[PDB]
Ligand binder design. Sequence first.
Ligand SMILES: O=C(/C=C/c1ccc(O)cc1)CC/C=C/c1ccc(O)cc1
Lengths: 171, 167
Amino acid sequence: QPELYAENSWREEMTGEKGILIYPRELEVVGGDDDSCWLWHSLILESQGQLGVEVPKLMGTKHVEVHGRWKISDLTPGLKYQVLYMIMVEDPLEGWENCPLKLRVTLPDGSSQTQQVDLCKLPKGQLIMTVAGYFDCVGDGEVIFSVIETSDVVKKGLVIKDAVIRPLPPM
Amino acid sequence: ELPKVYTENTWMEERNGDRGMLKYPRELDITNVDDGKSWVWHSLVFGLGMEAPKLMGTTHVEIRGDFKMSKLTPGLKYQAVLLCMKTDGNEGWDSCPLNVELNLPDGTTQKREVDLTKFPTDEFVMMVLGYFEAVESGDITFSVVDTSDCVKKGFVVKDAALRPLPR
Ligand SMILES: O=C(/C=C/c1ccc(O)cc1)CC/C=C/c1ccc(O)cc1
């Protein structure tokens, strides 16, 4: 089939604002090239075929660290934006008890906000929308959005689908 | 070849359990998509690819889809959207708006005309199908249609989604 290359983004129809999707191959996955840490999979939806996304599955490491970034000046000014990490957990799951996955958003001013998500309570296999944080689209520099867990325990079973940077528009 | 992770076309908000869903082009009903002329299936590649159809030239544009309310979150307010793109070299859209309908289980229908010449070129747009509050059961259907005399060209369909209002 002929290939069509496109920007991984969208514009809201009536109001114009730009949202961003970032596939995991474009994130900074620490240990991403080590199969004993992350093993890369093809994402399948049966009724459609392959969704065209390579996703990492955590295989047994103590160091979970994934980073994305985006220039705030590339987004729509004055809007409040919301960063999401889309994830899934699958058997076997291990190591996450009382070590919630940390979601962080860092701004150009060095300020940062962190949320925590208890992977042990998530229903396995369901695609999960997690909220990493919020920011107003002003100024420039890069916003950094991460998932982190570096506690001294071997972890398994986390799958990262993608990161999303989405405006909160009026309607 | 890589090992696989299987998914379903729903998602859930970690923070409260609210659900959304989407459907990909092979899950939609696109008239004449296999006629070998009106639509050509492309490999849509971001940054592997997904199978997405591009409109290459026809007067008959008819895209339909459906969703089950039971998979949504009762009481929650939704936005229904079609992710699609007007590509460089598009034709026919000056005189022919697309006619868009969202049909809800309560018998109502939201209708609008969509002038595609106002879409940006070569980037995806969340075309608004409509808005609704989800109930416990019933069928949701939508259509994006024009069959007028203008030969329409340069339009990619990516996916249809039912999402809780962004917040
Ligand atoms: O604001 C939202 C945008 C959804 C969306 C769905 C399909 C697209 O083409 C572009 C955006 C809803 C919350 C995020 C849903 C989502 C589902 C799967 C995925 O991989 C990424 C996000």
